[PDB]
Amino acid sequence: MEKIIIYGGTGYIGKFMVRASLSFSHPTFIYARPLTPDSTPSSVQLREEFRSMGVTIIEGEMEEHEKMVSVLKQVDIVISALPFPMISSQIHIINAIKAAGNIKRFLPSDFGCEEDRIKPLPPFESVLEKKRIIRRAIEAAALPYTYVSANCFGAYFVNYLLHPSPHPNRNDDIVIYGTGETKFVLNYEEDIAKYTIKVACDPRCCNRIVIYRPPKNIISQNELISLWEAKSGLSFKKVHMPDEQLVRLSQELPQPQNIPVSILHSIFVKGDLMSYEMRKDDIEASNLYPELEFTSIDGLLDLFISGRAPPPTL
Numbered sequence: 001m002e003k004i005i006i007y008g009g010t011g012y013i014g015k016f017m018v019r020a021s022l023s024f025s026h027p028t029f030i031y032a033r034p035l036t037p038d039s040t041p042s043s044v045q046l047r048e049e050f051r052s053m054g055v056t057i058i059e060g061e062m063e064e065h066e067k068m069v070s071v072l073k074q075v076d077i078v079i080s081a082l083p084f085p086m087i088s089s090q091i092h093i094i095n096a097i098k099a100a101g102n103i104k105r106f107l108p109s110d111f112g113c114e115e116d117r118i119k120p121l122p123p124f125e126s127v128l129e130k131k132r133i134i135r136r137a138i139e140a141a142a143l144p145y146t147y148v149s150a151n152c153f154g155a156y157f158v159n160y161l162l163h164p165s166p167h168p169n170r171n172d173d174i175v176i177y178g179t180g181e182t183k184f185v186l187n188y189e190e191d192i193a194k195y196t197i198k199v200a201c202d203p204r205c206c207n208r209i210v211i212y213r214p215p216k217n218i219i220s221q222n223e224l225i226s227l228w229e230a231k232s233g234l235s236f237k238k239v240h241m242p243d244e245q246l247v248r249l250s251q252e253l254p255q256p257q258n259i260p261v262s263i264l265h266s267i268f269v270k271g272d273l274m275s276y277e278m279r280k281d282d283i284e285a286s287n288l289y290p291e292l293e294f295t296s297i298d299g300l301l302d303l304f305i306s307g308r309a310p311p312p313t314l
């Protein structure tokens, strides 16, 4: 099987990718920054867990070109799950990949919306521009790539939008962004990870934009809430944050506090995750692997009720 190295492997979505890679029998590696006295105990725990699972951990800084090239010459696929503050640093990955010359595929840290076909409010557009610059650098180096639009991380957004708790109360306030009829897609993290590993090894997805849009996971905030209320057995106080308020906040709030509201405006008001139809060269992943299936929204919510869903995260 193809050998896979993951940057940001100890991250929120990164850890799912590492486990999926191993589960699909791929020799797995991660390039990680050296630990420090302030390293969160969580980051320390994950590295120990990964090592015990057979993951090869290469410790180093992004600026260590020779170290990165040496490792990349030993693998076939590179997947980056680095966070926004580290997006620009991916240029070092691109340079090490080109120097190595043996890499079959590079998946930059996209995993969101399809940045090349949307234009959100200034605060969000600014961060998206960093990801676009990485894409332009990939194209300039002529590297084999796959740009993944994973759409909404399932557990991440259910926690954010519904904040499930042991004992819900009528007054545990539910916020609806915009009017709530805008369609978006919610995909469970474990599935996003599994499909990403398959996609990275699939020749059909080389040098292509791949979108995770399983038909059963397309939903509006109002539909999601109705489903959640039916399952939770109670009616929540629902409040709206209309388009105008989100726009106003994106302009009046300081940075980076103005980014969250800008992202919510893009996803739930402009509907940038469903305001476009699949293109010719565009690939929808749920149609690719008969052996795989995206967990339905109903299934994702049951995961939360059963108390087996990922915990809240920043």
Ligand SMILES: NC(=O)c1ccc[n+]([C@@H]2O[C@H](COP(=O)([O-])OP(=O)(O)OC[C@H]3O[C@@H](n4cnc5c(N)ncnc54)[C@H](OP(=O)(O)O)[C@@H]3O)[C@@H](O)[C@H]2O)c1
Pocket (backbone or CB within 6 Å): 007, 008, 009, 010, 011, 012, 013, 014, 032, 033, 043, 044, 081, 082, 083, 084, 086, 109, 110, 111, 112, 113, 150, 151, 152, 153, 156
């Ligand atoms: N579609 C969606 O709903 C959605 C939601 C959230 C995120 N995303 C996207 O998914 C991607 C990853 O997001 P995420 O939330 O998973 O990221 P995250 O959890 O914040 O990633 C942090 C990870 O990178 C490392 N790291 C952090 N700061 C670093 C630094 N200064 N130098 C070196 N390594 C550093 C960490 O290693 P340590 O263990 O050493 O700390 C950790 O592995 C991004 O492209 C993001 O935009 C999409």
